[PDB]
RNA sequence: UUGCUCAAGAGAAGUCAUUUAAUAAGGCCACUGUUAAACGUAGGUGAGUCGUGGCUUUAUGCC
């Protein structure tokens, strides 16, 4: 539980889009080079109010949330702490970071989950489940629907060179882990693309969030 | 030259021989340094798009 920590920093700045992951990891290890490094670190979904133009308003309660080892903390703090970067021509702030714990909770939920060469929601199951066995966890598999029951795909661009590449995923609920399981779900979590903002796992009420709109 | 003129109280000697201020005594018997306290201000919860390329053994990860 506590053996991990999120470090969260309270964001202010010009409205984001809704698929920054590139984005905001690009700004973050042009601003600290040894992010682009480490291995055991992710960055939670940045909070806020959507636009109409997909793309997100930073409230008060938007704040850039870093998953990283205790044990890494003061390679990234100094490069964090106060600092601003630029994504794009916008400007954005860090305030003094502050720490959050790794708690556990009945049920999970991941905005956004990419396996690589899988892009039916059948597979996709599969392979959460196989990744899934490989953690020693133990729980159920469910995808995040639309209005509409669909499962839902969450699509990341990440604009390496004047290319820009497409992958797709999915939300993926998982119930039933039991406190330990459930902390080591979310540590671990699934997908791989941590630091590409996708693979962090969240408490199930943040699952509600996302699907009422 | 003065009721004066001159004028030694002088020579010599143990204050000595001997003695316990001693014999006996509790400064004792009873006591909580106790009952209470953050190294600590604190500023809170909201999200949508469709089908994959350069490295790596499929898988799977990095961009």
Do not use: W
């Not at 806020?48 to 938007?62: F, H, K, M, W, Y």
């Not at 106060?82 to 970071?97: C, E, K």
């Not at 609920?173 to 796992?201: A, H, V, W, Y």
């Amino acid at each position: 539980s506590e053996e991990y920590v999120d470090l969260t920093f309270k964001l202010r700045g010009a409205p984001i889009p809704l698929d920054n992951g590139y984005l905001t990891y690009a700004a973050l290890s042009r601003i600290c080079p040894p992010l682009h490094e480490l291995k055991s670190i992710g960055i939670h979904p940045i909070a806020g109010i959507p636009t109409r133009n997909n793309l997100l308003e930073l409230t008060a309660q938007s704040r850039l949330k870093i998953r990283i080892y205790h044990q890494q903390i003061p390679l990234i703090y100094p490069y964090l702490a106060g600092q601003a970067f630029h994504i794009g021509q916008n400007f954005y702030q860090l305030d003094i970071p502050d720490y959050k714990p790794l708690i556990s909770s009945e049920s999970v939920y991941s905005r956004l989950v990419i396996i690589k060469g899988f892009q039916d929601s059948t597979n996709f199951i599969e392979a959460v489940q196989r990744q899934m066995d490989n953690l020693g966890i133990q729980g159920k598999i469910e995808l995040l629907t639309r209005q509409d029951g669909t499962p839902q795909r969450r699509q990341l661009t990440i604009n390496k060179e004047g290319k820009q590449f497409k992958v797709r995923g999915f939300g993926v609920k998982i119930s039933e882990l039991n406190p330990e399981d459930s902390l080591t779900l979310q540590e671990q979590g699934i997908g791989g693309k941590r630091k590409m903002m996708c693979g962090i796992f969240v408490p199930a009420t943040r699952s509600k969030e996302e699907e009422e709109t």
